[PDB]
Amino acid sequence: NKQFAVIGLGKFGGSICKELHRMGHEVLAVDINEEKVNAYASYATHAVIANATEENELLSLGIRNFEYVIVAIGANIQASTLTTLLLKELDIPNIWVKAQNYYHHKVLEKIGADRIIHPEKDMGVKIAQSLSDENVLNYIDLSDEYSIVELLATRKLDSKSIIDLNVRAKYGCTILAIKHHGDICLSPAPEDIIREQDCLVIMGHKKDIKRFENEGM
Amino acid sequence: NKQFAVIGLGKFGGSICKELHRMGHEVLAVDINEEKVNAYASYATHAVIANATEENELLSLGIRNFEYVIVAIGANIQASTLTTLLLKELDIPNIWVKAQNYYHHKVLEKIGADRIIHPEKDMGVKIAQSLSDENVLNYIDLSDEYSIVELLATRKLDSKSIIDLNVRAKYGCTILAIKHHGDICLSPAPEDIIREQDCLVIMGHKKDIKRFENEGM
Amino acid sequence: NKQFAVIGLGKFGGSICKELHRMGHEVLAVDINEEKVNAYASYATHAVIANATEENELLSLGIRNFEYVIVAIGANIQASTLTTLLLKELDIPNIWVKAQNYYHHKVLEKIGADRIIHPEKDMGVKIAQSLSDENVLNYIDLSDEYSIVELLATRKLDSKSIIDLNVRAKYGCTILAIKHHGDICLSPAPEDIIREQDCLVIMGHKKDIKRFENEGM
Amino acid sequence: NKQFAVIGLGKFGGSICKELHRMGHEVLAVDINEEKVNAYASYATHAVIANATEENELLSLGIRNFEYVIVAIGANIQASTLTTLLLKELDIPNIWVKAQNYYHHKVLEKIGADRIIHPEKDMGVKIAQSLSDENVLNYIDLSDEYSIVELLATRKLDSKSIIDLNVRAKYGCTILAIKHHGDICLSPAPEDIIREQDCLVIMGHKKDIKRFENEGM
Amino acid sequence: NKQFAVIGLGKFGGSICKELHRMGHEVLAVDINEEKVNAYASYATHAVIANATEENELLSLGIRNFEYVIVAIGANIQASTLTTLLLKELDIPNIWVKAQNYYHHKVLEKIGADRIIHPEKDMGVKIAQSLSDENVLNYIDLSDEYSIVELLATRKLDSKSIIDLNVRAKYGCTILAIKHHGDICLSPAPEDIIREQDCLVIMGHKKDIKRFENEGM
Amino acid sequence: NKQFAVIGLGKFGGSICKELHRMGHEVLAVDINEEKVNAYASYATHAVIANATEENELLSLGIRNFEYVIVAIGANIQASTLTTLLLKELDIPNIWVKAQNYYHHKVLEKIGADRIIHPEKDMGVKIAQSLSDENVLNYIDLSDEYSIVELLATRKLDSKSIIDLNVRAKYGCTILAIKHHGDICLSPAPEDIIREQDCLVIMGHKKDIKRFENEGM
Amino acid sequence: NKQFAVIGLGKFGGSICKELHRMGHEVLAVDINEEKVNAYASYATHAVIANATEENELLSLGIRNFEYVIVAIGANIQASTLTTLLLKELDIPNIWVKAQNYYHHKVLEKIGADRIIHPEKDMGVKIAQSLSDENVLNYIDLSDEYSIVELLATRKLDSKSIIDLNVRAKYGCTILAIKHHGDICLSPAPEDIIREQDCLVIMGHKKDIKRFENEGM
Amino acid sequence: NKQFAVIGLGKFGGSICKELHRMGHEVLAVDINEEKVNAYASYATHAVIANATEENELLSLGIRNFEYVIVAIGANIQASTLTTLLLKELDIPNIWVKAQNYYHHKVLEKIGADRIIHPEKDMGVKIAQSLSDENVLNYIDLSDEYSIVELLATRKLDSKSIIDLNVRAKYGCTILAIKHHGDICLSPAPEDIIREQDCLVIMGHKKDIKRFENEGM
Ligand SMILES: Nc1ncnc2c1ncn2[C@@H]1O[C@H](COP(=O)(O)OP(=O)(O)OP(=O)(O)O)[C@@H](O)[C@H]1O
Ligand SMILES: Nc1ncnc2c1ncn2[C@@H]1O[C@H](COP(=O)(O)OP(=O)(O)OP(=O)(O)O)[C@@H](O)[C@H]1O
Ligand SMILES: Nc1ncnc2c1ncn2[C@@H]1O[C@H](COP(=O)(O)OP(=O)(O)OP(=O)(O)O)[C@@H](O)[C@H]1O
Ligand SMILES: Nc1ncnc2c1ncn2[C@@H]1O[C@H](COP(=O)(O)OP(=O)(O)OP(=O)(O)O)[C@@H](O)[C@H]1O
Ligand SMILES: Nc1ncnc2c1ncn2[C@@H]1O[C@H](COP(=O)(O)OP(=O)(O)OP(=O)(O)O)[C@@H](O)[C@H]1O
Ligand SMILES: Nc1ncnc2c1ncn2[C@@H]1O[C@H](COP(=O)(O)OP(=O)(O)OP(=O)(O)O)[C@@H](O)[C@H]1O
Ligand SMILES: Nc1ncnc2c1ncn2[C@@H]1O[C@H](COP(=O)(O)OP(=O)(O)OP(=O)(O)O)[C@@H](O)[C@H]1O
Ligand SMILES: Nc1ncnc2c1ncn2[C@@H]1O[C@H](COP(=O)(O)OP(=O)(O)OP(=O)(O)O)[C@@H](O)[C@H]1O
Ligand SMILES: [Mg+2]
Ligand SMILES: [Mg+2]
Ligand SMILES: [Mg+2]
Ligand SMILES: [Mg+2]
């Protein structure tokens, strides 16, 4: 198993920490706030109150031993930067960091952060795609032009067959799965039917999917 | 003429707003802080300084015209709650709200929020899946048991064929796409090759995909 | 005996608590402030310093055991709401709450508060009726139209008899009691006399009482 | 032309003011906070931003014209005290003041407050009487020993007659009114019936009424 | 000996306390601030940290035992008033208090303060008399019209005799003493001489002294 | 045309200023707080809002014209010090300053303050002399050993004569004046009488006066 | 036409700015605090209130025209860092920055600061050399081993000659100048005399100079 | 060895302290802040948390024993002044102090400070000379007119000989040393060569050096 250290138990770092622990990884949870440590005590291997900008407190944690250190300190950009800097001077292999704004990203780039993350910004985009198009539940982008989309089927599609909805020739797309009442269907045959309020997973060019949406559903 | 309003220009609400505007929608940006309003002025149809807990200022915005209002107020849970309440009493069709913790989600549920979002929590999970398994670039869950995953191909897969990597019989999975040097390939034929550092899109059972990772790549 | 828990020892909750204890009920007084607990220590069965928004501290009090929980937290609406929410998730039979404004009342309604109280507002109305009409000492409303009123008798009524003041036929009212020098007279006979500065208790339609007041006294 | 002024638009002073205005009296609303003044502007003849501890601002209001001034300043005991003092030195006939604690009552007493009110304390007692005895809706005390009480009739009293519920001989009390489905009955005849969930108004000794509750209903 | 308690060790109360102790009186020094108590520990019989508004802490000091209690609390008028009120309810014979402004004096009057003092105001007047008239070192007023004045002798008076300066007939005044080089002369004979920069003590009507000053010196 | 300026309208500086104005002198009132300036506007020739630590604002006042400047700044020792320094560097003839503690006196001494005053300390001593000896109304010290004292005559002295109270031989003191019912008597003859509650002005050695108090009155 | 801009008018940035202006250079003074700007207005070509972390305000200054920008922001490390970053992204040739601590120096290094200065640290060293050795007035280091030092000549050297103080052979040092009563002598001849309290400028090895001090002077 | 006490461990005092300790002197480090003491604990003989304005804490340190006390307290001018004052009243031989502004210097002068220092201001000037003239690395002033300068040699001087650059006759200057690749050359002969990017140390009149710079390099 790998060993992870997560500094900053916010909504983000807390989630990261809780989720890794659930996977059975050795995870060290670190926060300057005692109430936070108490909160996540139950969801990590070790939970320690510590100020990560204090180099002596850092050595006490033995943070040099970890292959992954996740800096999820947000509001205090000085703490985030200074922590990252210390971690870099300690030759930690992979240092992942949560960023607050463009300029925070840049300094983190310059001082040797390995992966920089913008949780809210990324989700904002995802959610906006949903707001604009009530049909989309979730999606993943293969590139700027191609995507896999999970659609909420309407009445227009009720009792329609996959061959009846020819997307491979008509729209250059392919249906990958159907989810009905919780039961899942993968790579359905040309004879398989779709009913309304099912989850329909389609793959193809974005504009072509939007076209299938406007005309098909 | 659909109209979206975004109250609270944080990292989350800001992204949504900026993103909605980019798609060419009518978007109203709203914040109590003037500096925020000045900032997103360039990324919205209209931007207005306003306190969203004040019913009068709310009516003044012409909020009646909007079908969607996104409450992206974070730190101040009271402001978020009261805003949602006011919006609900003004009979706004769809109210989407950013939640801070479990209990904030509960009250928003009870006072009639139409969609509740936890951006940081959701990305924390996603990022953790990446941390444990450096191979995963991005993924989407079809159900509790099934997922679609985009993998960064290793040397073990370099110059290997789709039939050579028999996954449909060997692992019960199916390859959906290959991305090489930027060029994209959909529903690749049995003869198609994979090169190292390409993107490979695989669909199947979570456990079966992970097995392919351990043994296949 | 029933068991009561009172969270928030303000002027209101303090009064509630002190008065119940005087009646010989098992009452638990709860406040986050130590000085408050010390103040009401002498007026409750148990007095405990506790933060009622902390679910663990709540379970420690054993608050699930109580049939009545009175939330008399005022200034901090977030604390009041969150406390009520926790109490509801603990399936407490009767949760009574002090409200700060209209919108605070609404959320408390929505999250399952059983009785909501506005001590100041109710008293404001009562006192205003006194300010407008110096004759009224106290009253109770039977409905929007009918009331029982305690009047301070003037000189105009000095040495007048109940039959001399025919209210049952002249004003459609009835005299219920006379209080003289502290001595009380209930359901006085037609021959009983009233002297000035006595307390006179009359029942009837509000406008009819006001008429008795304008013309009679 | 009686003139009332209300200084301090809290929940208490606000209610009074709003209520006085509703009765069609000349009312002046006064507060140091502008937002409060804007709020009760709609519920007063005139509303003025003013600091009531400033003698000059006080004279500017034309406070000389008012016969009644209500000091509903709460948190800031110094402001309340100083205001009352100033009003007294300006020879205002009637000064009613909201008290925070025993000692605030004492000083207001000594510096010549005409009426001192403890809204929260008074309602706390009232509400406690309701808590212990779910039957009591509202009541009024005639003396330390005698009271008039409005009861919510139970099934034990459903379809029972006034003579059947002989209370004048059995409990030494008298029934004053019955409220059924909204309809009101005053001084009901011996043949009048009571149905469940009706309101029953009883007069007598506190102990005698409570006995009727235990045995009668 | 008498027993004194001094609450509030400011410049004033500190001076009072230090000076009484020097006279060999039993003095209790009281302050809420620990650093103050430490400062005056060396200048009082007993020095105790205490909040004088807390009735229990007051009884612990045994403050009922003292014939004199000096309230020298200044900035916090609420503390000063409330302390005085408590002391009065404890039937303390002589309660002397330091006042901040006219209205503070009035309430202190009303709640039964025995002597009220304005140290700065009184000194301001004294010093102003010095500023206007550089000749006056110190003085005492016998009434609005008569005074005893200590003057700094100028050159105009050098080598002048008391008979040479006839003040009893010319100005209706009398010389009471001469201070030369530190040596003091009381009730000097008509033959006694005054030299410059001596201290000359004169008694008479104020205007007459000013006249002696303008014309004589 | 003498000109006085008073910087710092505290209780001390305010009194001086008000008092100087009353004597008909040209007085300039100066304070950083606008509310203070508005207050003493009525009690000064001119009143100006100004920060006295700012050399420019100081010159703007035309402070060059003043022969006397009184620094009555208290709480902020830095402001007092810096003001005095600036005044001294602007070659103001006489700078009188209010001191907060021993060390503030020392620095003001070193930076050339012309007179240093400790109003509270000085009155504390005076008041203490009154506390120990209720007989003393007011007094003035001629030296370390000699004083002039105004006594409130007791019954022991009622209706007694000056020769009957032989103090010049018996106690080595001399009676300087008698004040009866407001009427004043200077250098009273041997036949003059003293009545109770009169004011008696005695001069002599401190110890001799105190003896007369113990034995004489 | 070289243009210098100084952001942050602290003791350091202020001196630079004032000094650059004195040499007759085009200098722009920049600070977020208005009072600072008003102060150095007289010592700069132009002085502008501006927040230097705001890219827009920065462009508005015409900062593109400047070849040198000095960041003399101290307490707020974030402001200093962000300013430097912005300047670097605006392609300013030379960015000199004042550092607060080791780590601030490191980040400024990484984000491309052209010169980093530690004024206080550098003077601390210099002053310490003066403290240990009262003889040294000022010095400059040529390397880790060699220095040029200005000494205050003692009596031991009074009236002594350069050949008499043979330092080139005896101590391996050379005398570079003598300053007597203000008059200066460069590369003095073997016959030149030194008098006490003159300034003597010596060059050599640090250890050799110190030896000359112990034995020579 | 001498004994030094350094009060105020800032960038300045910290540097002073660290540097003296490195020289092997007995140094006492003093700061009110615990974190500071911990920081410099490793760089001083004794390190003590103390408030230097508290005369008792000062005596506890035994500060009377030291020949040198360095007051390096900056932001708090009151602390700096008051400390210096106390040290002076304790008859400490040499008290060196860090100054904040002109007026702070003046009071420190007046209360008997022995040496006053302005670290930032002095460095500001030095650095400004560098900004104006990129050739100057470092320098020392012998007087207002004469200086020793360390120059960064350009290409214009590459392979030039000292005789080729006749400065003694042409510019009235003399070359004192050459630093090449780290190797140092002192008092080089007329035949010695200079290469670019070497450090060249020249002595003479300032204007004459600037002339050598403009024309020579
Ligand atoms: N110097 C530090 N050392 C350790 N932990 C720190 C330090 N500074 C801040 N933290 C922790 O970082 C955590 C998250 O930071 P914060 O909540 O301010 O950012 P945020 O963007 O609001 O985070 P999120 O969106 O994840 O809630 C906090 O729980 C805080 O205790
Ligand atoms: N009452 C209000 N009316 C309008 N806007 C508000 C109100 N209260 C807060 N805001 C705005 O909402 C925005 C987001 O709030 P905040 O930044 O505290 O949330 P956050 O949890 O940090 O969100 P993010 O993670 O997206 O930055 C802020 O820019 C703030 O100015
Ligand atoms: N989270 C909490 N847990 C327990 N007690 C709390 C909490 N928050 C506030 N309280 C308590 O609530 C009490 C009353 O609240 P507060 O006085 O602020 O409201 P209020 O309307 O002024 O009340 P009142 O009118 O009854 O005096 C306070 O004594 C406070 O200690
Ligand atoms: N000096 C003053 N002059 C005028 N108004 C004042 C002054 N001081 C306070 N007020 C106002 O008085 C009002 C009531 O005071 P506050 O809300 O603190 O009392 P409270 O005990 O909370 O009363 P309630 O329970 O009725 O809300 C406030 O709206 C406040 O703006
Ligand atoms: N509630 C209290 N109980 C006891 N001591 C108190 C209390 N409140 C204030 N004090 C004390 O009163 C003392 C003097 O008050 P303060 O200095 O604020 O008034 P001041 O007018 O500036 O006094 P002075 O002019 O005498 O210095 C302080 O030393 C403070 O500790
Ligand atoms: N820099 C300044 N320039 C002008 N006025 C000032 C300055 N600093 C303070 N003052 C004013 O000086 C006045 C007196 O100061 P302060 O009230 O703190 O002294 P104090 O010791 O309480 O004196 P007192 O006992 O006479 O009230 C205040 O009214 C204040 O507004
Ligand atoms: N964001 C900003 N934009 C412009 N100026 C700023 C900004 N932040 C701070 N300053 C200014 O920079 C100046 C210097 O900062 P500060 O005084 O905190 O540093 P310091 O370490 O005390 O420096 P010094 O020792 O030179 O006084 C201040 O006068 C301040 O007004
Ligand atoms: N009363 C005091 N007694 C002892 N130390 C003190 C006292 N007051 C302040 N100090 C210390 O003085 C030190 C330096 O002061 P400060 O940093 O405020 O000035 P500065 O000019 O910013 O200093 P520098 O430029 O040297 O960093 C601080 O470490 C602080 O703890
Ligand atoms: Mg966030
Ligand atoms: Mg209340
Ligand atoms: Mg004072
Ligand atoms: Mg500094």
Author numbering:
A (entry chain A), B (entry chain B), C (entry chain A), D (entry chain B), E (entry chain A), F (entry chain B), ...: 6 to 222
Tell me, in the authors' exact words, what the paper reports.
KtrA binds nucleotides, ATP or ADP. ATP binding induces the adoption of a square-conformation by the octameric ring and increased K+ flux activity through KtrAB; ADP binding results in a non-square conformation and decreased flux.
The structures of R16K (at 2.7 Å resolution) and R16A (at 3.4 Å resolution) with ATP are very similar to that of the previously determined wild-type KtrA-ATP (WT-ATP), adopting the square conformation. In the ATP-bound rings, these distances are similar in the R16K (30.8/30.8 Å), R16A (29.9/29.9 Å) mutants and wild-type (30.0/30.0 Å) structures. A clue for the role of E125 is revealed by the 2.7 Å structure of the ATP-bound R16K KtrA mutant. The coordinating atoms are provided by the γ-phosphate of both ATP molecules, by two water molecules and by the carboxylic groups of the two E125 residues. The octahedral coordination of the ion along with the majority of the coordination distances fit well with the expected coordination of a magnesium ion; however, the interaction distances with the oxygen atoms in the phosphate groups are longer than expected. Overall, we conclude that the ion bound to the intra-dimer interface site is a magnesium ion.
